[PDB]
Write a protein that binds this ligand. Sequence first.
Ligand SMILES: Nc1ncnc2c1ncn2[C@@H]1O[C@H](COP(=O)(O)OP(=O)(O)O)[C@@H](O)[C@H]1O
Ligand SMILES: Nc1ncnc2c1ncn2[C@@H]1O[C@H](COP(=O)(O)O)[C@@H](O)[C@H]1O
Lengths: 227, 225
Amino acid sequence: AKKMIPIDDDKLIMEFKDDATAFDGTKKARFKGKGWLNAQLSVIFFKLLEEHGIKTHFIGVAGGNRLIVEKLDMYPLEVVVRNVVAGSLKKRLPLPEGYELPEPIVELYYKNDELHDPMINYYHAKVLGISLDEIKKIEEIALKVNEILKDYLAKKGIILVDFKLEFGKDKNGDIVLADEISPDTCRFWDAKTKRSLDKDVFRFDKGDLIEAYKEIYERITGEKPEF
Amino acid sequence: AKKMIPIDDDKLIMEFKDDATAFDGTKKARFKGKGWLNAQLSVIFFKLLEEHGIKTHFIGVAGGNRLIVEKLDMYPLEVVVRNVVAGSLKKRLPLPEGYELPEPIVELYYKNDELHDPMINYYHAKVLGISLDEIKKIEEIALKVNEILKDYLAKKGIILVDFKLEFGKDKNGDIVLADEISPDTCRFWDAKTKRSLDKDVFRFDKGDLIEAYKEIYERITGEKP
Ligand SMILES: Nc1ncnc2c1ncn2[C@@H]1O[C@H](COP(=O)(O)OP(=O)(O)O)[C@@H](O)[C@H]1O
Ligand SMILES: Nc1ncnc2c1ncn2[C@@H]1O[C@H](COP(=O)(O)O)[C@@H](O)[C@H]1O
């Protein structure tokens, strides 16, 4: 759903596509405007985080669905932060869907399609070449990011249920937030209704995807999406 | 503005008055219903915090403006947590009123009327007989309380600008949140207008006090006082 095009050694173009993919590509569709919405939401979120002093790969915009980002030495991780019990966490704790967690949970996943992104702990992370110090920093950033995104979205009647983050190392060796932040990579629920406003709408055919993603955009910006 | 009446060695009654006092009692008034509103908002906030596992001195209600609280060995501190630049923080950092801080700031004040509650640091606190361990616990609780209060109020279009907390030691030696939590001891701003919904309205004659405190209450409860 994204294309990474290298500009040079320092920079690349992240292009968001209108393709939607779930269940290892066994379920696929295209939603006109999805790429635009995801790019624009990523811009909003990355700028918000940078305002709080979070280091992100975001450099600038190069068209409706194209971000310019700094090239990173990526950690082989998908880092998940969870505020509310949903999806696979039901398989892990004896708690019902929608349960509000007393504190956020950080889960580490080894980014590997072949192994279907298995959950790992700090010991596995060391084997993958990631020091305890780096992990500690990664989780600390992830929790900060969580608190900012959660609070921002709560004021707009959106529950940040959970979300996935990726990180890499820049030239200086600092840990930098990467990839995207969009309804493809977060679970958003409406505060009142608890309806999904995210990719789960596509995964489980619970409604209209473009409609859900526009809802998010409109609530954040106050403007209906055009282009 | 409060009267503490001992029940026994374990408990006391915190009675909220209608008296308002600012600038070392050089500015004083009375607002009918103020005590009731402060008592009730304190109840709401203490219960909200206990729901999250914060240990507080709150035991129960004994009338509209009376709380039953557990008696504590008090730390000689006023602990201030700040999310948004206001008041005296403008005197300390090169930042404008209303500036949103990247992270909350915790300030320690030695509770002493004579010295006009001076700011202190961890070294001063040790002199006052407070260990670095206790200070760390206090600030950790204070930051926890901050996050819960701030998030709760934000959902209701209220900015928790800053607020003052006090702590004491119970019989077990645990650190327990005490005093009150109300528009007397917090800075609340309306999210949209940025108007004060707290004691600042009385301090600087920026509007109707009872009106501002009722606003807070109504937004929280959904009911008019
Ligand atoms: N649980 C408690 N146990 C003992 N003392 C307390 C407790 N809660 C509050 N206090 C103290 O009781 C006093 C009541 O507040 P107030 O009358 O406004 O006093 P002041 O204006 O002198 O700070 C405060 O000095 C506060 O430190
Ligand atoms: N700033 C960055 N530098 C290098 N790689 C990145 C950056 N941001 C994201 N990536 C990776 O680029 C790929 C684009 O994601 P996708 O094509 O959706 O799998 C993913 O493998 C990301 O981990």
